[PDB]
């Protein structure tokens, strides 16, 4: 049996109603449960037997359905409700999970504060150079971070990481790390990260010149 969840992802403002659907490839009667999972943590039971609220779960969560069509509804979305939500059928073995639906909290636009960090002297002695760019406390998550070395756009030598959405103000932070050999790093003067974001009227560039120039 296949459990297909829709949508795969969604954003909605605080106070809004969110509806997630799970459809089964065969009649699973009402043997369908819903789980909330926050990143890195054990899933939490929300709804069992299609429509029953598990003890302790907030009254804003509800469930409906039977047969082949089931829904989870959050009637008033709160900032702490960002999670991946999963349906599971248990009418027949093997039990099968849905793909999951990521819920994000929509909020007003917020421009990132941007910081750049040169490689340490310790690292340089190892023979490698990491340059780090920080974008702090912004929304939406979509951001274009471009590396320029002596004003030349960089290709396949950086990796980004993003934090989970803040539980109170619903913002993100992001790091981009540029990795170069010490030989390459010491051939260039200007290291710059350029940030494009919906909150910024024009792109913001932070840079340093190697050799405290």
């Amino acid at each position: 049996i296949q459990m297909t969840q829709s949508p795969s992802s969604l954003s909605a403002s605080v106070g809004d109603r969110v509806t997630i659907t799970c459809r089964a490839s065969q009649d699973v009667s009402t043997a369908v449960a819903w789980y909330q999972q926050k990143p890195g943590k054990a899933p939490k039971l929300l709804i069992y037997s299609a429509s029953f609220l598990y003890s302790g779960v907030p009254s804003r969560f509800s469930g409906s359905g039977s047969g082949t069509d089931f829904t989870l509804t959050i009637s008033s979305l709160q900032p702490e409700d960002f999670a991946t939500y999963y349906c599971q059928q248990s009418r027949i073995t093997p039990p099968t999970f849905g793909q999951g639906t990521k819920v994000e909290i929509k909020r007003t636009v917020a421009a990132p504060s941007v910081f750049i960090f040169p490689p340490s002297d310790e690292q340089l002695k190892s023979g490698t150079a990491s340059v780090v760019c920080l974008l702090n406390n912004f929304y939406p998550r979509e951001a274009k971070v471009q590396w320029k070395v002596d004003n030349a756009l960089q290709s396949g030598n950086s990796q980004e990481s993003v934090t989970e959405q803040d539980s109170k103000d619903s913002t993100y932070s992001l790091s981009s790390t540029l990795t170069l050999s010490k030989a390459d790093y010491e051939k260039h003067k200007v290291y710059a990260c350029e940030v494009t974001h919906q909150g910024l009227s024009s792109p913001v560039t932070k840079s340093f010149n190697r050799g405290e120039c």
Binding site: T30, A31, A33, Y35, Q37, G40, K41, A42, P43, K44, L45, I47, Y48, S49, F52, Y54, T84, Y86, Q88, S90, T93, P94, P95, T96, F97, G98, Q99, G100, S113, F115, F117, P118, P119, S120, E122, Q123, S126, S130, V132, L134, N136, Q159, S161, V162, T163, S173, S175, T177, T179
Partner: protein, 214 residues
């Protein structure tokens, strides 16, 4: 209170074996079915196996059948997952859970235990300062460690406001890296000391790095 507590996870060679344990408190395991569920890095939840300890009936996901064995010892109120012929595909956080019925669901879950299947050796991180230069940002780069996880605190836990510790990223070398950053008053940079406390249990590495203005 009902509690499920897992143990037995860690780093293993491909082809190797590992036994996970799930110890139940506040209920008798024979009253329910006990399930193992896993989550591979960046993927969704995958059911792996269940057991009804009252009769020892079991079922397995097709990808695990033959290789894994679920069992239970009712006299220890504990269930087990014996994992053999381990492959990289089995790298995941493993959870145990109880399924309750009245029609039901998995109401109590273990904390999860990380199983990493790899031939790579343990390696502790190098910790490099991200030096600052009104709000100023500073941090530490925790580079080239294996396996996960690493823990990072600031000033031995006294600094928590404004801290962002990013998820680890696998580098092309097969080793992990992450950064932790914090924003502080610009006026504090000269006189207040900022220390990144890094712990990597798998290699028994503990590092404290002072981050100073450059």
């Amino acid at each position: 209170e009902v509690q499920l507590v897992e143990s037995g996870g860690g780093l293993v060679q491909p082809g190797g074996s590992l036994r996970l344990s799930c110890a139940a408190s506040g209920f008798t395991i024979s009253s329910n079915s006990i399930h193992w569920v896993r989550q591979a890095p960046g993927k969704g939840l995958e059911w792996v196996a269940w057991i009804t300890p009252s009769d020892g009936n079991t079922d397995y996901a097709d990808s695990v059948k033959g290789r894994f064995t679920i069992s239970a010892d009712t006299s220890k109120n504990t269930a087990y997952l014996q994992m053999n012929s381990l492959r990289a595909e089995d790298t995941a956080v493993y959870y145990c859970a109880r399924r309750v019925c009245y029609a039901g669901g998995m109401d109590y879950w273990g904390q999860g235990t990380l199983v990493t299947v790899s031939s790579a050796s343990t390696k502790g991180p190098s910790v490099f300062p991200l030096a600052p230069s009104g709000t100023a940002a500073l941090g530490c780069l925790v580079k080239d460690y294996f396996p996960e996880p690493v823990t990072v605190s600031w000033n031995s836990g006294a600094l928590t406001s404004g801290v962002h510790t990013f998820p680890a990223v696998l580098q092309s070398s097969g080793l992990y890296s992450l950064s932790s950053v914090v924003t502080v008053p610009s006026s504090s940079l000269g006189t207040q000391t900022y220390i990144c406390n890094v712990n990597h249990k798998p290699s028994n590495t503990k590092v404290d790095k002072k981050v100073e203005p450059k």
